[PDB]
């Protein structure tokens, strides 16, 4: 877990998938659902280091978890922690959308941030934490995220 409250996240490419700002909105989007229900706040910087470090690669990419190109693999986030700690991988051989067509940005990115904050992934099939990409219409987070998330941050109001 994170000591600080406070975190700062950065885009650092972008999918060509997507036009830039609905790539941002996916993201935002994604850190606004654990931002409103913990005391956690975000700031996202455009240049230079941030905690939780966004990227969007393929196949070996550094780290020793490397894509497998189109499917199977969509997405990885580490644990908290400085430098990789935190920091989120998207696989662009993913085809990356803003709609019901598959592979919804906003809902894998809501995942990944889910691991990056400290969870794991969860038994409840209704939970956004759980290890099976569904695409809904709405998406809120489950008790069982709430509750996962709290204990961890502890709540917002
Ligand atoms: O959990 C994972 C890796 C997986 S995965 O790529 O299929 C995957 C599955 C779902 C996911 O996020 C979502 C979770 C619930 C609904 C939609 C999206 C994000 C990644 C592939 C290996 O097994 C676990 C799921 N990454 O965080
Ligand atoms: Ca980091
Ligand atoms: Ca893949
Ligand atoms: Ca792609
Ligand atoms: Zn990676
Ligand atoms: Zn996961």
């Given at each position: 877990?994170?000591?600080?409250?406070?975190?700062?996240?950065?885009?650092?490419?972008?999918?060509?998938?997507?036009?830039?700002?609905?790539?941002?909105?996916?993201?935002?989007?994604?850190?606004?659902?654990?931002?409103?229900?913990?005391?956690?706040?975000?700031?996202?910087?455009?240049?230079?280091?941030?905690?939780?470090?966004?990227?969007?690669?393929?196949?070996?990419?550094?780290?020793?978890?490397?894509?497998?190109?189109?499917?199977?693999?969509?997405?990885?986030?580490?644990?908290?922690?400085?430098?990789?700690?935190?920091?989120?991988?998207?696989?662009?051989?993913?085809?990356?959308?803003?709609?019901?067509?598959?592979?919804?940005?906003?809902?894998?990115?809501?995942?990944?941030?889910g691991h990056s904050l400290g969870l794991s992934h969860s038994t409840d099939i209704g939970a956004l934490?759980?290890?099976?990409?569904?695409?809904?219409?709405?998406?809120?987070?489950?008790?069982?995220?709430?509750?996962?998330?709290?204990?961890?941050?502890?709540?917002?109001?």
């Amino acid at each position: 877990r994170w000591e600080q409250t406070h975190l700062t996240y950065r885009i650092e490419n972008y999918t060509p998938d997507l036009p830039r700002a609905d790539v941002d909105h996916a993201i935002e989007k994604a850190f606004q659902l654990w931002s409103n229900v913990t005391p956690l706040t975000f700031t996202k910087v455009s240049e230079g280091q941030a905690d939780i470090m966004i990227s969007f690669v393929r196949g070996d990419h550094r780290d020793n978890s490397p894509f497998d190109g189109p499917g199977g693999n969509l997405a990885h986030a580490f644990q908290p922690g400085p430098g990789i700690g935190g920091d989120a991988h998207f696989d662009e051989d993913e085809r990356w959308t803003n709609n019901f067509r598959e592979y919804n940005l906003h809902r894998v990115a809501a995942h990944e941030l889910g691991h990056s904050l400290g969870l794991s992934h969860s038994t409840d099939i209704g939970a956004l934490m759980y290890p099976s990409y569904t695409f809904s219409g709405d998406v809120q987070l489950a008790q069982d995220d709430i509750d996962g998330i709290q204990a961890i941050y502890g709540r917002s109001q």
